[PDB]
Amino acid sequence: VDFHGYARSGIGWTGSGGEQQCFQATGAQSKYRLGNECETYAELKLGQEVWKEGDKSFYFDTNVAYSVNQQNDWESTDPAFREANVQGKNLIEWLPGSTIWAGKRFYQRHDVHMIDFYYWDISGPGAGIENIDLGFGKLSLAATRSTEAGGSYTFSSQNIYDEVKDTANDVFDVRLAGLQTNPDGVLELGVDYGRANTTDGYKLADGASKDGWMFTAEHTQSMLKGYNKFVVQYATDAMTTQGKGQARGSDGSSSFTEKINYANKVINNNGNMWRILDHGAISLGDKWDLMYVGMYQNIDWDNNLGTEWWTVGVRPMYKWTPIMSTLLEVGYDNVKSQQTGDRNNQYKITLAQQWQAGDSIWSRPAIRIFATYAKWDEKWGYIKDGDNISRYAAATNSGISTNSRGDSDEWTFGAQMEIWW
Amino acid sequence: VDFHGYARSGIGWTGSGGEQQCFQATGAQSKYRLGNECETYAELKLGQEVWKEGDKSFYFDTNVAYSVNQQNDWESTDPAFREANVQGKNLIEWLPGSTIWAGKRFYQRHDVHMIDFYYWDISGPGAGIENIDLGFGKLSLAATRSTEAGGSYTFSSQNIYDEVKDTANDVFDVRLAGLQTNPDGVLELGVDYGRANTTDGYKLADGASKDGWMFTAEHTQSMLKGYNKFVVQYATDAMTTQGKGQARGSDGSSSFTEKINYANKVINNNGNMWRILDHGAISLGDKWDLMYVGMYQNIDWDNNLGTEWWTVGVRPMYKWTPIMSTLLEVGYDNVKSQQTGDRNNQYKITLAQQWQAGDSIWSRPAIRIFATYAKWDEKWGYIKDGDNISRYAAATNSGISTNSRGDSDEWTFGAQMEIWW
Amino acid sequence: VDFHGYARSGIGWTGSGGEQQCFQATGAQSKYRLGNECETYAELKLGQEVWKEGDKSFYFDTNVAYSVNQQNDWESTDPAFREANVQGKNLIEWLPGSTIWAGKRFYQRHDVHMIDFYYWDISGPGAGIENIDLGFGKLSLAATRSTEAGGSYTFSSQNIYDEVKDTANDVFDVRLAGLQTNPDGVLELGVDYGRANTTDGYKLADGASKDGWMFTAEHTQSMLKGYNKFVVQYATDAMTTQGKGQARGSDGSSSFTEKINYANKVINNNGNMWRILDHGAISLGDKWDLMYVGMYQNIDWDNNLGTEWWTVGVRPMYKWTPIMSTLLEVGYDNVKSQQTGDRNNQYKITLAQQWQAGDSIWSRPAIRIFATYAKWDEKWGYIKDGDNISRYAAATNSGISTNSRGDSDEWTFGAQMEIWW
């Protein structure tokens, strides 16, 4: 049996008191993770090549995830059963080298490690055929599913309904990778079309976006014993909410019962998204490794409830010895509310001493001892409707109750381990 | 460590819209599974032979099961811890070859794969000694437990009680296997006696069945590079509800509080069950394999709330190549309500293209692409008491709200993987 | 992958009726386990030495625990994710042989097997450096965390608060082990300082103990092919509730809302605890093994709600053959309520026939068939406030509703397996 996975766990303190606190800018879809992770997360994968005959084989893979708050020894949880699929390699004679698969699977995910941000992730239940050799590149086709809560109604009279149902969103994915564009440079193109797919008799409330498209272009350049990836993505309507390739076609739906059930008008995700990303990991000589990110993301919703986000960060690693190093991470986030026009910003600086299994910025396991400082100035926040957070924003100053963190700073410190195997 | 288990996962669509839907005749205890399974189910077993000295050994086995709806990537669930037992082989000198065991264990289960129907399954917490060599056959003795919710009350006066408690049901199982009845034919006999076992002070409500018996005779005939199993089973009272060997002695109990607690009259399972089953798997030459089932089951309850069920099905497999085949599954169900006398029927046809690790209808893993068509005509259904389904039936036409699916049809299609290792 | 763990599972019956019942003296923190365990408990550990280079290595370990009531086959549960840590050996050149670690971990726990009682257990999220060689002994430093529910309030005026929060309790642990005091005798000394650590803005209600100390001295003497451990521990205030090294600094807090939130005065754990323990496992010749415990524990609280507990037990094993033996366990508990001055007592006798993987009282797996008899006389119980048990006690006779079991006896019998691997 093959044992693989990922895990992080630690203990931390907040300078002003109590357990460690993690800092993320209101409106930003991520945070600079070094010394800024507040939970024990673990994925335990058990897989096996169950059959092999010649060039043909069947591989079975699983994945059970656990997330606990690391507050005590005994911590109960509901594990997420994320993967359970079978991959058959070389079974289709006329499509030599291709792999056919079916089941729940993390499918060709693309992420930026330092901000733990996935920008191309259509994982979930699915099926497809990958690595079809076109000579000049590899073609991959796949269909996966996601499901939204509610959104499908059996309308009796106009917007009064009898029953609600969860809405299945299908995604059809096509990717062409390995296009040699220049020496040591490769290009991958991808298209995603997603849509809400309602059960017969059910319908989406008035105004649901229904569907959308997403286009991705990623260029990988090998250099400095590492790489640099340049990404450009454009998403449309239903693909703007999740923003990684999964469709949210009934996003914004709601209803109220009095007992006559009324399906409110959908406060939809019609609009578009532009993401220009550039990240990499390179070696600057014998003693230095460097990870970096630079991203501009603009979610332009017709309804004007979107955000414009800028994030930049850098993580240099100095190698004292092959197993010991000092890491520094500096990250900056600036988010502008499309609705109010105000801006929120945060910058965090983390200094960590580390012992890792190898001399790479990518070597894991790693045991860290760190100190983090975060300073933020948030001029807006989402209107906190009691306990639930609204899609609407309000300036911190306007007496409205928002989830804005205000203007402040804090520092934390502690120990942590991270590992993938 | 030994890694074993079972898993199925896939993605599907309903011809008329939305996610895949699965078809089972109202009143039937199973359904024809090919291209008619709607969840990701997986059992991960990790076991080990922990000690061995000569012919003696101790084997430790576990089993953790997961069932998720395959609607998204992240799906939390409460896994069922189903097995955790130790088996000691050859420890009893005077009972050479026998195995003694204790713990939660899937104990000698008998099922029909194509309809995923278990007909002899007393699994659960238990202990026993199996494979005692009698020369002309093997004797096995076991005691397992199951528990019903409520059913035990501390009666103060009449049907008024202070406290309720869950009811333990003990099963005492005896089996004699390996009786050579004819060339290539073997017979196994089994007897099960089960009873609700109340805690001192507690009592079952009026009408509870309390105990029952079940008798099983299974003949296995080796032929056509496969087999044919003929089964005859007769169950009495408490053994008719589950119908596989576990006792439901307080089945039908209920109470209402106003705060004076009243234990209603138990609408018991007194009566009998007859099951005549014939299923098999054989090879018809080089290119054909075939699975088939034929079953008649009659649950005759004193209260007339039972059912008479007929099910027949066939699953031929045509081998294009050693790893690729086309499967067809045709199954028919007919259920007569003992109460109303009405009949429900369904027939489903499934066509699937498959790639499997081997050339047997039993080879797994398997990756399938299928299309299913189901047509049904249901004249009755269980009275849907609001959201909960009642033990009482009503004709579809009688204005009463039942769970009957009426007269209709549907078709689905998708991809799925199934594997046992 | 390294597979390790612990598991127990069985089936039992109570002489007077129904499932097996387990016997523990009201007020006692443990019970004599042989044939007196009523659940299936299992810990499945999957670990791996993920990197090694010379004398340096990184070991990754995990632990997922399950506890089910063994009442049925399918039993859903929320597993506890208890361990996920990395240990790096020999990474600090100037502290040769020491191991640094971070993550959730069972850290150097000390327990008495036969009563399943842990007396030194600060396990949980943490980090530390162990086995620093001092020549005359080994030094270990660690910091772990535990969390209490509520206990931290944002007070607006007096004892009226806006928000509550869970309270983090930090423990700083120092141990010196391996002090050679006499031939075949070794001594370990340990100090624990724990304190509630509140988030800025939050405060503990009035009267909270806030912090405390615990001192441990354990002497191990090797003899009779086994050992004898003599332990003396003294705990103070916040360390008296859990009593194993973890801090409960806001223990006793409560609040009531009317909506004005009032934080009641903390019914604290100020006081002290004395624990004098002596346990061991030795071999008396070829046919006899013996486990024994003797303990006096006195929790003297200022609020007079503590207990004085005496427990003594013996478990001799007679070896019929190398894999078969007869075990007898006799245990006695006597608990005096500090509050009422009344005493509760229980004695249990267990006789078991066992088959184990080896000839030691410590050999596992083991399959047992047993019969247990327990007789108790409880003069007091904790005031059962409806369904919840209070910190206050009352004599059984005083018409007050307590959880006292009265004066009675019972006997059970069954089969069970236990294993650690």
Ligand SMILES: OC[C@H]1O[C@H](O[C@H]2[C@H](O)[C@@H](O)[C@@H](O[C@H]3[C@H](O)[C@@H](O)[C@H](O)O[C@@H]3CO)O[C@@H]2CO)[C@H](O)[C@@H](O)[C@@H]1O
């Ligand atoms: O294994 C390869 C990748 O491993 C690392 O990715 C980790 C993330 O660091 C970790 O946060 C976690 O991400 C999940 C996230 O926690 C969860 O809330 C979200 O819903 O799904 C995320 C995807 O699982 O797990 C992944 C590994 O699965 C590493 O950061 C990355 O660079 C590697 O490519």
Ligand SMILES: OC[C@H]1O[C@H](O[C@H]2[C@H](O)[C@@H](O)[C@@H](O[C@H]3[C@H](O)[C@@H](O)[C@H](O)O[C@@H]3CO)O[C@@H]2CO)[C@H](O)[C@@H](O)[C@@H]1O
């Ligand atoms: O492993 C040998 C058997 O494997 C297969 O049986 C599977 C079933 O196909 C699968 O549905 C599942 O059955 C369980 C069912 O899903 C659950 O709801 C019920 O409560 O318990 C059932 C028993 O576990 O798991 C079994 C494997 O345990 C195969 O179909 C069968 O022919 C093989 O003998």
Ligand SMILES: OC[C@H]1O[C@H](O[C@H]2[C@H](O)[C@@H](O)[C@@H](O[C@H]3[C@H](O)[C@@H](O)[C@H](O)O[C@@H]3CO)O[C@@H]2CO)[C@H](O)[C@@H](O)[C@@H]1O
């Ligand atoms: O593995 C070494 C130890 O194994 C055995 O200890 C078991 C206990 O017997 C078992 O009850 C369980 O204890 C846990 C308890 O059930 C749980 O409720 C509590 O919160 O935590 C306890 C610690 O896990 O698990 C331990 C093993 O972790 C054996 O009894 C002991 O002597 C061995 O040292």
Ligand SMILES: [Ca+2]
């Ligand atoms: Ca749960």
